Design an enzyme around this catalytic site. Sequence first.
Site, PDB file in Angstrom:
ATOM      1  N   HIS A 285       0.980  -1.210   0.005  1.00  4.68           N
ATOM      2  CA  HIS A 285       0.069   0.086  -0.112  1.00  4.68           C
ATOM      3  C   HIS A 285       0.884   1.278  -0.040  1.00  4.68           C
ATOM      4  O   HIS A 285       1.279   1.502   0.907  1.00  4.68           O
ATOM      5  CB  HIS A 285      -0.876   0.064   1.244  1.00  4.68           C
ATOM      6  CG  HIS A 285      -2.090   1.155   1.171  1.00  4.68           C
ATOM      7  ND1 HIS A 285      -3.415   1.070   1.251  1.00  4.68           N
ATOM      8  CD2 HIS A 285      -1.761   2.447   1.054  1.00  4.68           C
ATOM      9  CE1 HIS A 285      -4.007   2.147   1.377  1.00  4.68           C
ATOM     10  NE2 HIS A 285      -2.966   3.273   0.854  1.00  4.68           N
TER      11      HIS A 285
ATOM     12  N   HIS B 269       1.889   5.161  -2.441  1.00  3.04           N
ATOM     13  CA  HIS B 269       1.548   6.034  -3.823  1.00  3.04           C
ATOM     14  C   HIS B 269       2.754   6.710  -4.172  1.00  3.04           C
ATOM     15  O   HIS B 269       3.626   7.110  -3.256  1.00  3.04           O
ATOM     16  CB  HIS B 269       0.553   6.943  -3.044  1.00  3.04           C
ATOM     17  CG  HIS B 269      -0.789   6.550  -2.541  1.00  3.04           C
ATOM     18  ND1 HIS B 269      -1.698   6.158  -3.205  1.00  3.04           N
ATOM     19  CD2 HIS B 269      -1.006   6.272  -1.188  1.00  3.04           C
ATOM     20  CE1 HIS B 269      -2.726   5.913  -2.299  1.00  3.04           C
ATOM     21  NE2 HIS B 269      -2.054   5.636  -0.987  1.00  3.04           N
TER      22      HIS B 269
ATOM     23  N   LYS C 181      -8.728  -1.073  -5.892  1.00  2.00           N
ATOM     24  CA  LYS C 181      -8.703  -0.189  -4.459  1.00  2.00           C
ATOM     25  C   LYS C 181     -10.270   0.171  -4.243  1.00  2.00           C
ATOM     26  O   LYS C 181     -10.710   0.923  -5.002  1.00  2.00           O
ATOM     27  CB  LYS C 181      -7.596   0.665  -4.613  1.00  2.00           C
ATOM     28  CG  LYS C 181      -7.785   2.050  -3.493  1.00  2.00           C
ATOM     29  CD  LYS C 181      -7.452   1.390  -2.252  1.00  2.00           C
ATOM     30  CE  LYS C 181      -7.307   2.571  -1.082  1.00  2.00           C
ATOM     31  NZ  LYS C 181      -6.206   3.567  -1.062  1.00  2.00           N
TER      32      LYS C 181
ATOM     33  N   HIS D  37      -9.395   0.938   2.010  1.00  2.00           N
ATOM     34  CA  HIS D  37      -9.245   2.082   2.885  1.00  2.00           C
ATOM     35  C   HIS D  37     -10.382   1.852   3.706  1.00  2.00           C
ATOM     36  O   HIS D  37     -11.657   1.998   3.309  1.00  2.00           O
ATOM     37  CB  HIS D  37      -9.398   3.528   2.075  1.00  2.00           C
ATOM     38  CG  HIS D  37      -9.299   4.685   3.006  1.00  2.00           C
ATOM     39  ND1 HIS D  37      -8.116   5.492   3.085  1.00  2.00           N
ATOM     40  CD2 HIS D  37     -10.322   5.215   3.819  1.00  2.00           C
ATOM     41  CE1 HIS D  37      -8.383   6.446   3.908  1.00  2.00           C
ATOM     42  NE2 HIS D  37      -9.660   6.308   4.246  1.00  2.00           N
TER      43      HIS D  37
ATOM     44  N   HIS E 125      -5.338   0.060   6.413  1.00  2.00           N
ATOM     45  CA  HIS E 125      -5.413   1.106   7.685  1.00  2.00           C
ATOM     46  C   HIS E 125      -5.862   0.244   8.901  1.00  2.00           C
ATOM     47  O   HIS E 125      -6.218   0.929   9.759  1.00  2.00           O
ATOM     48  CB  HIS E 125      -6.338   2.264   7.209  1.00  2.00           C
ATOM     49  CG  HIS E 125      -5.910   2.801   6.072  1.00  2.00           C
ATOM     50  ND1 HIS E 125      -4.668   2.616   5.233  1.00  2.00           N
ATOM     51  CD2 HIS E 125      -6.584   3.740   5.237  1.00  2.00           C
ATOM     52  CE1 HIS E 125      -4.581   3.430   4.263  1.00  2.00           C
ATOM     53  NE2 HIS E 125      -5.637   3.891   4.100  1.00  2.00           N
TER      54      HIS E 125
ATOM     55  N   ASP F 198      -4.928   1.395  12.560  1.00  5.72           N
ATOM     56  CA  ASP F 198      -5.428   2.598  13.304  1.00  5.72           C
ATOM     57  C   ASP F 198      -5.993   2.324  14.321  1.00  5.72           C
ATOM     58  O   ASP F 198      -6.721   3.124  15.292  1.00  5.72           O
ATOM     59  CB  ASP F 198      -6.222   3.608  12.241  1.00  5.72           C
ATOM     60  CG  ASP F 198      -5.539   4.088  11.293  1.00  5.72           C
ATOM     61  OD1 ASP F 198      -4.150   4.651  11.527  1.00  5.72           O
ATOM     62  OD2 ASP F 198      -6.196   4.568  10.151  1.00  5.72           O
TER      63      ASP F 198
ATOM     64  N   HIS G 237      -0.202   1.882   8.227  1.00  4.59           N
ATOM     65  CA  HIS G 237       0.074   3.334   8.806  1.00  4.59           C
ATOM     66  C   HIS G 237       1.012   3.367   9.952  1.00  4.59           C
ATOM     67  O   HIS G 237       0.766   4.241  10.733  1.00  4.59           O
ATOM     68  CB  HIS G 237      -1.417   3.658   9.249  1.00  4.59           C
ATOM     69  CG  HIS G 237      -2.038   4.300   8.311  1.00  4.59           C
ATOM     70  ND1 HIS G 237      -3.373   5.059   8.432  1.00  4.59           N
ATOM     71  CD2 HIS G 237      -2.038   4.573   6.952  1.00  4.59           C
ATOM     72  CE1 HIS G 237      -3.837   5.324   7.294  1.00  4.59           C
ATOM     73  NE2 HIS G 237      -2.828   5.372   6.371  1.00  4.59           N
TER      74      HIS G 237
ATOM     75  N   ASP H 246       2.149   3.267   3.365  1.00  6.33           N
ATOM     76  CA  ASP H 246       1.243   4.311   2.892  1.00  6.33           C
ATOM     77  C   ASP H 246       1.906   5.691   2.825  1.00  6.33           C
ATOM     78  O   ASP H 246       1.359   6.725   3.277  1.00  6.33           O
ATOM     79  CB  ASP H 246      -0.207   4.411   3.632  1.00  6.33           C
ATOM     80  CG  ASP H 246      -1.301   5.128   2.981  1.00  6.33           C
ATOM     81  OD1 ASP H 246      -1.426   5.238   1.736  1.00  6.33           O
ATOM     82  OD2 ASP H 246      -2.039   5.718   3.696  1.00  6.33           O
TER      83      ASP H 246
HETATM   84  C1  CAC Z   1      -4.554   8.527   0.022  1.00  2.00           C
HETATM   85 AS1  CAC Z   1      -4.710   7.985   1.877  1.00  2.00          AS
HETATM   86  C2  CAC Z   1      -4.180   9.199   3.102  1.00  2.00           C
HETATM   87  O1  CAC Z   1      -6.327   7.543   2.192  1.00  2.00           O
HETATM   88  O2  CAC Z   1      -4.065   6.025   2.050  1.00  2.00           O
HETATM   89 ZN    ZN Z   2      -6.315   5.102   2.468  1.00  2.00          ZN
HETATM   90 ZN    ZN Z   3      -3.054   4.995   0.655  1.00  2.00          ZN
END
Ligand code: CAC
Ligand code: ZN
Ligand code: ZN
Lengths: 316, 320
Positions: free
Chosen positions: A22, A24, A136, A168, A197, A200, A221, A254
């Site tokens: 994960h 970008h 995604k 997400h 995520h 979290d 994260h 991430d």
């Molecule tokens: C693009 As994001 C901060 O939702 O992993």
């Molecule tokens: Zn995300």
């Molecule tokens: Zn992301």
Amino acid sequence: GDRINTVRGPITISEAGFTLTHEHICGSSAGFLRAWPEFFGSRKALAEKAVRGLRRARAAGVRTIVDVSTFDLGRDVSLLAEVSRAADVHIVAATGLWLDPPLSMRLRSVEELTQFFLREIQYGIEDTGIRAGIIKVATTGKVTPFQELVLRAAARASLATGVPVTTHTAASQRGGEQQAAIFESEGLSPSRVCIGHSDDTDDLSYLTALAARGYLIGLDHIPHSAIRSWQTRALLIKALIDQGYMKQILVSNDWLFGFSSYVTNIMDVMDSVNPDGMAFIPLRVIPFLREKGIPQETLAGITVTNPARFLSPTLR
Amino acid sequence: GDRINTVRGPITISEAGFTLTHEHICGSSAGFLRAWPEFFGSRKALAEKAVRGLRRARAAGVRTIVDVSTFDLGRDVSLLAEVSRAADVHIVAATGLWLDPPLSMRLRSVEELTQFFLREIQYGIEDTGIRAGIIKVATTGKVTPFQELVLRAAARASLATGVPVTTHTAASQRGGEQQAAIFESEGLSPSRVCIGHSDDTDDLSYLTALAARGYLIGLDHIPHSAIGLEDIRSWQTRALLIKALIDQGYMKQILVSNDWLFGFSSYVTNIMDVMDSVNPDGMAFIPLRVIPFLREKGIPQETLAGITVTNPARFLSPTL
Ligand SMILES: C[As](C)(=O)[O-]
Ligand SMILES: [Zn+2]
Ligand SMILES: [Zn+2]
Ligand SMILES: C[As](C)(=O)[O-]
Ligand SMILES: [Zn+2]
Ligand SMILES: [Zn+2]
């Protein structure tokens, strides 16, 4: 079967190596990088920053990243291809939709959304011939009516192609529960799905219950700790290993190198807090886990074997 | 002064001729035409439909259209350039923001937005070198905090370059009044602003008061009448607003258009087939139906030429 589509073409499973599932290159909006590249200094400055960042992750052992930027996150696969070639790092591109779909997407039926996701997997993204290797999707705790269409379209695209789905979530709202319910109503196998995520939350029983059903748990994260420390998030990895779910864990940063879908200068804040960038997982989390007694074979299974099994197109 | 930017380059104002000031090649979303062209059949099918439609408009007398598609309406200036050359019709491109800004735009300051608008006017759109000749903005009755930033950025760009501003409004909300107040707080002359979609209302008091202040009145929804659910007036009743404004002495403040398009993804599927089966004339509706209707009502030829040629030329000429 055992081939994965990347921005440079198909690769075999064994070529993927240590994979961050994960990441970008640039978190943006559809059309934005081409309409206003000066927001990032320039397109060349952004590309050069991303190549240095990938080359460093590579020196820390990373061989593949999955860029889970969707259409509405401003995915620019031409950029991904350029940086992948200069860095000698494999990049897997995504289809799907994140949390900022434009009207031309928000007004579509599930059947239309299914066709768009399938085009990006089976034909290619835009006119580049580069095909997506992952789907995604994103929701906000309680799934909106449109988000439910996206998840069902993603399940149908996954079922027709074997390509996996990654999400997400708002983990504090236990958002993976409603996602899993929709996926299973469509007949999608949980082993094709990563609930992202997930670090979290501190609710281990929520994570274990999902892992027990066959879902992949995306702990991505760890370097976003900014009250729990990153070490405390990383201990969720060890907790899931101890429950016997090492096969269900995926680990990532991430991270990104440009970020326009947030307030101005957020990238400078983020880089000062995590100067390691995408190397945070290999440079900090892996040694932390080895010092807490996790053996090399387990760490290799999580960072190499698990992503290979996840990304390899499968309908069984 | 006397030169304006088109998608084929600069032209002198005397070459604009009969100009439709509110049109679209394709109403879409940022990135959408290049990511999902088969939504329109194909990019080639869409270009060919636009070329055919613009050719019939040119046969009817149209020489220039203003495409008020912004970034967030999926403006693809390379498509505009292709169809303008093939139809031999001038197209003026737009900057600004409509009602669907993505996060990367929604989170920007008024200063940042000003730089974006100035980039597309003074430097070029994307990497094409094509420059905008108009700024398009949009509000929904009660102006939102972000929409107010967009209107202030548009006014500042207009004052810096002289290019005009044209707006989307809810005329049933008398939305032009809140827009005008924001524009004038920035020092923008009303002669540099067109209040669009104004034929959506019957309120002649509202329309004449804006015209009396120097605003251009955009009567651009005439062929949208027979599209039900919204409005029961025939297009003839809508067109009589043009005659109403002329009779009050405001002929110099009138702009007329079709607000037509050849593809439309920012709406429910198959809307384009409903729109075309209702108005087969497309962009030729104004020259072929409305202008003869007005001439029958006794409006002199020289007044119609003023409305369809002179007023667009004064509006588009970079002035300040
Ligand atoms: C693009 As994001 C901060 O939702 O992993
Ligand atoms: Zn995300
Ligand atoms: Zn992301
Ligand atoms: C793109 As429109 C229907 O607001 O003129
Ligand atoms: Zn409008
Ligand atoms: Zn319009």
